[PDB]
């Protein structure tokens, strides 16, 4: 069964840094675009960026480009999100997810992790 | 931001089991491409990850009940839940794939079990 498991969440002081992990299983990683999506408490969903593990092509949204970096460890079948100079506005549940394409050509997020909470305290 | 913004209506709503409900999604620009509408609907249960319901505006994801239906094109979309079931209570998000990835702000759907009080004096 296809699965994604996030880890690394916790309480961080402003200006602090944190690394989140996304362990993928039940599929070999390399073919798929892997994404990081966050959800502020009681709010909507925000796409951070993507990575294709095979060639390590990465696209981070303009909004996060200067402080958030996406990487992979192909040996560990895992994706990572490095978050720097954290601010109160970064308090959110962070998910990793993947996009798949149907036979008709439609692509979307199908499997998600359970999420990990990042809280930026005083 | 240069993103395709998605605005949902209403922000929250309540209804009873067996009721028909509609949630709308308006895009800041067309999400269409080659006769397809690149618009998804996700259901998020409390404390859980979002779950795909509808893709390409009207296509039902595998295993999703027929009571969920999606319609619309261009900039205006609707998620219709005919005959609500108790498990259908969650936060619903429209989501577009025409330009990168954006989501609506979400619409919280809650169960109504009793009547609203009549504040007459």
């Amino acid at each position: 069964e296809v699965q994604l498991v996030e880890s690394g969440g916790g309480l961080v002081q402003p200006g602090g840094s944190l690394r989140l992990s996304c362990a993928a299983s039940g599929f070999t990683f390399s073919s798929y675009w892997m994404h990081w999506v966050r959800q502020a408490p009681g709010k909507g969903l925000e796409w951070i960026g993507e990575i294709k593990p095979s060639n390590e092509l990465t696209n981070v949204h303009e909004k996060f480009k200067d402080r958030f970096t996406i990487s992979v460890d192909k040996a560990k079948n895992s994706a990572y999100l490095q978050m720097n100079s954290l601010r109160a506005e970064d308090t959110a549940v962070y998910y990793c997810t993947r996009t798949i394409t149907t036979t008709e050509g439609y692509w979307f997020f199908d499997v998600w992790g359970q999420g990990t909470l990042v809280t930026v305290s005083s | 931001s240069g993103d395709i913004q998605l605005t949902q209506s209403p922000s929250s709503l309540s209804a009873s089991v067996g009721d028909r409900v509609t949630i709308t999604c308006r895009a800041s620009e067309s999400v269409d491409y080659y006769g397809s509408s690149l618009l998804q609907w996700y259901q998020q249960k409390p404390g859980k990850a979002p779950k795909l319901l509808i893709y390409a505006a009207s296509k039902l994801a595998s295993g999703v009940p027929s009571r969920f239906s999606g319609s619309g094109s261009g900039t205006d979309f609707t998620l219709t839940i005919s005959s609500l079931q108790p498990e259908d209570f969650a936060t619903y998000y429209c989501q577009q794939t025409r330009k990168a990835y954006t989501f609506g702000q979400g619409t919280k759907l809650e169960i109504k079990t009793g009547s609203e009080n009549l504040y007459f004096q």
Binding site: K52, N59, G105 | Y33
Partner: peptide
């Protein structure tokens, strides 16, 4: 075929079918 993103790849494949 200069894509570099999932969106570019997705639009390219969808258009071809």
């Amino acid at each position: 075929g200069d894509c570099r993103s999932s969106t570019c790849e997705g639009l390219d494949l969808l258009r071809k079918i």
